[PDB]
Amino acid sequence: SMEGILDFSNDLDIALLDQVVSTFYQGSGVQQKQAQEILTKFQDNPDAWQKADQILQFSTNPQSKFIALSILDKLITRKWKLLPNDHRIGIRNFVVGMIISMCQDDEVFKTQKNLINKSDLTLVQILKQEWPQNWPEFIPELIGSSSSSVNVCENNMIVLKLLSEEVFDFSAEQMTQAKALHLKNSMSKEFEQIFKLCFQVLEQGSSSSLIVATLESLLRYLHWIPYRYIYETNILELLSTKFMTSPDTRAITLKCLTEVSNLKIPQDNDLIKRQTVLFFQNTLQQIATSVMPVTADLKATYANANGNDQSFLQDLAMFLTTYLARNRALLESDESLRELLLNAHQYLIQLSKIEERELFKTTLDYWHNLVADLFYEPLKKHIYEEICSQLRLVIIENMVRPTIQLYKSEREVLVYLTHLNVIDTEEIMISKLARQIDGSEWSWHNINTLSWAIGSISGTMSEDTEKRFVVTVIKDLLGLCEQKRGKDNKAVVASDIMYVVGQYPRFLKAHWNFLRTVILKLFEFMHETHEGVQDMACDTFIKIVQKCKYHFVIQQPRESEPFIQTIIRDIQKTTADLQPQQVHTFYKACGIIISEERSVAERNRLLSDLMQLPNMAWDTIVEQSTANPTLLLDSETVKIIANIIKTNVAVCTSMGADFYPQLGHIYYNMLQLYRAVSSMISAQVAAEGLIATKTPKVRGLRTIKKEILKLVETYISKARNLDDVVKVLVEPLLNAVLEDYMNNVPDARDAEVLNCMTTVVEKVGHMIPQGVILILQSVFECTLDMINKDFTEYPEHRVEFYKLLKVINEKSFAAFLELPPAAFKLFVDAICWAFKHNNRDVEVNGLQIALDLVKNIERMGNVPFANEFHKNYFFIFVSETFFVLTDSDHKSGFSKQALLLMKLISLVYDNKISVPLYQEAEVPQGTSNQVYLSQYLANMLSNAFPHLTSEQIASFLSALTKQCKDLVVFKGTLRDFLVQIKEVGGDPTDYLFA
């Protein structure tokens, strides 16, 4: 019943329209959903625009008139030049008249702002098409009508605002370079007239709504207008005094001054300097008298959130930081400006206390600019000694856990501040720590915050002053741990004491006996059952081992042996109550220590002792595993095995190339296990179905295969002796994993196999031509069939597949030459298939492979395979690239598509393709590839874009071909093309921009 307006045979029922619209904006449920599909089908009707002036006149619903304008905007944007000259001027009229119609009506002008603004925007869309070439009197007429009324004058400021945005702020990638530059010049030629009107309104007053509309347009001008319109006039005086008193204009005025403040003024001009100091001086004076004094608690104001306080404070923070980051040097020299300078920073101190993360990140970015300036620039830090003092307290009190980005920012600022004055910083932290003991400011949030701050300034003091400082801190904290009686309260303090010592490795290095105590105490915590304590103990342990690995490997004077040996002895007793992961971290940490032993015989002996437990469990399992293969169905057995491998992966991570001796001890049996486990899965999938891949038993079995593969990756990637890798490791590996991967059902193929092969080829792939060939044969075709059906299924295999072809194409490109013709054809089909991926992990790889593939074929020279490649796949790569470039669904990869395309065109412009790319029949014998390239591309673009003229295509290609050596210009030409294929009547002269 509502689908009557969709019928364009008979006249449109305006009364019915206003009902269908009202049902959409005010209705609910099914009725609203049904109405939605109708309004969509209505405006998306190509003839709907014809029924625009009807609605704009007869309709009584503002929502209807809004949708009517949308239908016009869609017409003015896309099919404007296609219209007869009669309709064009006709639409211009009842859009202008409509605006005037609403401005004269004070009722409509107030209650329908949304509908007038939409009309204003619709007007600007016409200007972007017609002005100034076919409407040269627009601005002179606009200024004249701005004196006839206040409502009209106000609305004109809205039109000029939108006009400024569409031309300077959003013109790029919306219109061609030519059309943009043309519109920019047009406004620049007639701005003197606009500024005249604008300044008159600001000085003469006095309608509040008119002032704000004027100031809001002014904000857009400051993006591009010349400096003289700011300083050679008395406009800054007005902004920094008159308009900072009234709240309604205050918010926008402060934004205007923020844009002015962010200009690199003529540094040698002594008049603009005073002008830049003057308006800043006035602004702060008005705030101190008309808004809030410098002592005002801005933290509490922001929290209360009355009216526009939160917006104003944000804007004040943006203003002060922006100005002072550019011009504070002006206030530092003169003594009469010192009070102004510090008052400005004192406002930023108060702002920094506000609890609002995103606002705090803003002021923090400025403090970082300041303290860094005071850390390098001479005769400056003495000025801000009081500002810096408060700032220390502020950052220490608002410290976060080491998002992570925020902490590093805070640490970096706090380090600078501790350097500017060590004594002050130290005093503040001890005082904060004394108020923690007396229980005045005691809490879990405040004790942690203080600890984090104490640990962040590490390495900033002298080693001596640090010693006196650390002792005082650890003493107070240990005295605090004794004070508390709650088992939870003691856990909080113990963590902080261990975090702090973890941050001061220099202190640990100097004092072995103390370091020994810590580690021995961490081992005592590795038996603690309370939540988090064990993880804290292992984290601190490895954290300390990384920074002091040298003190665990050498023989300490007061000890009988290197402390690493003592750890390995009681490693079982130490790691007894730990979770499998916590044990892996412990073994990993030990690996970091053993890796420091430079003696080969000694390093290998420590490795044998560390891996004692897993090797004994391993040999036991491997003996029982082959004896009774059904033990792999036992969950507990699968768990033990997985942890043994994970323990190997952990240590191998720390030791890298030095792990080879341990790997060899288990390598042959580990791949034998990989084979037995694989058989067990296949037997399970056949006896239970594909659901078996989801069952706990199989998932555990697949874990073993993935951790075994992960170990091999970890070693080979970090291996030094590449000869050993090839001779010993590669052959058994490939003969164990490849055929298994190939002959498994798709849902039983581990994608980690592809990733493992990727690591192998990346490292030794240049030494294994038959190896890389064997890899392709086994994984290429079968994997491609899994992902050449859609863009979603098997996402893991998808990304690893193109990573593998990428490195293969880089390292061993020869393997692709050995591929049969039909197989090489699938290789090309796979690369272009990667172009079409919206997924960025695949799209980027796809393009890169194509780009490297062409370069590979190029450096083969003039040979049968290189020439056959061009005959076969050149124009394929060109069209497929053009497709993703213009289909408007792969914009994420525009830059790389352009680079690829530019490389393809340049091959023809340079005559680096010896053979002809065409058949002897379709073109007269003798024609160059250059000419045939323009014929192929011309014909291609015509069928793909039949709404483009032949002249557009000819100009685009002409400009595109003689710009294939300048990427930034080449890209600009493509972007111009992308703009013109979305409209009708694109100006073909736009491609002459360069």
Partner: peptide, 14 residues
């Protein structure tokens, strides 16, 4: 100064 600090740390119990 430190020898004491070591002893203090080694006596952290719950």
């Amino acid at each position: 100064m430190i020898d004491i600090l070591s002893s203090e740390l080694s006596h952290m119990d719950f």
